[PDB]
Amino acid sequence: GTILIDLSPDDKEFQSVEEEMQSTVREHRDGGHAGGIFNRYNILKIQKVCNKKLWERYTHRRKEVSEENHNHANERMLFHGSPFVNAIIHKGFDERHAYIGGMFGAGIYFAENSSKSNQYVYGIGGGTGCPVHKDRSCYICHRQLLFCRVTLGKSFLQFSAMAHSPPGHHSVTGRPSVNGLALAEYVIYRGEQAYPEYLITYQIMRPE
Numbered sequence: 001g002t003i004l005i006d007l008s009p010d011d012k013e014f015q016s017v018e019e020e021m022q023s024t025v026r027e028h029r030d031g032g033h034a035g036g037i038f039n040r041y042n043i044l045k046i047q048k049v050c051n052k053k054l055w056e057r058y059t060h061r062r063k064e065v066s067e068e069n070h071n072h073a074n075e076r077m078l079f080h081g082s083p084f085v086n087a088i089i090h091k092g093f094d095e096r097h098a099y100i101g102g103m104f105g106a107g108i109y110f111a112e113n114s115s116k117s118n119q120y121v122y123g124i125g126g127g128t129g130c131p132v133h134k135d136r137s138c139y140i141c142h143r144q145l146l147f148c149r150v151t152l153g154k155s156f157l158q159f160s161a162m163a164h165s166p167p168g169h170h171s172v173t174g175r176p177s178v179n180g181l182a183l184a185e186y187v188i189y190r191g192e193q194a195y196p197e198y199l200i201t202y203q204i205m206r207p208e
């Protein structure tokens with residue numbers, strides 16, 4: 001059902017997605033342990049993910065949430081890193097893509113910082129790094145992230161140092177309360193509340 005359409009680097013859509021990727025890199029408290037050491041990416045390709053059935057599943061759920069929240073879906077564009085990115089783009093998000101051990105419970109986690117999602121491309125904590133070299137800071141191997149359309153609806157705000165949403169809420173927002181430079185992270189508990197809209201293929205770049 002899924003087709004992938006390559007965007008040209010001349011396309012304003014490519015440019016706007018690249019800019020969100022690059023501009024939301026931050027330093028991480030692990031000094032690069034999980035995701036590697038870098039300040040920027042080399043973007044190799046950006047593809048639009050087109051699947052009519054998954055799109056209709058998303059918009060059906062979005063309308064439900066909106067009607068429960070004063071006609072406000074509270075839709076965001078957020079990054080998702082996962083070893084299961086190939087399954088996600090063909091089958092959609094579901095309970096198999098949940099982070100069972102996440103600190104807001106078993107749900108599907110998304111990030112405003114692209115470099116936060118980068119930490120999960122090779123698994124939780126970066127797993128053992130890239131399959132070829134076993135290096136979490138590999139500068140050679142190609143990595144992929146999703147930039148996704150996510151319905152938050154009424155989001156439970158957790159000030160911060162599969163399962164169900166807190167009653168009366170459609171998601172959780174993990175607001176950083178210690179690291180002043182971190183952006184928010186978000187959790188949904190239904191796969192129908194996200195659509196994997198762009199597939200971004202990239203390398204992290206060694207600082208010079």
Ligand SMILES: Cc1ccc(C2=NC(=O)C3=CC=C[NH+](C)C3=C2)cc1
Pocket residue numbers: 079080081082083097098099100102109110111116117118120123124185186
């Ligand atoms: C199995 C799996 C898949 C994805 C993640 C994951 N992917 C993410 O993109 C992400 C962004 C922000 C916070 N967290 C906890 C995140 C977790 C974790 C485990």
Ligand SMILES: [Zn+2]
Pocket residue numbers: 130131132133134135138139140141
């Ligand atoms: Zn490698």
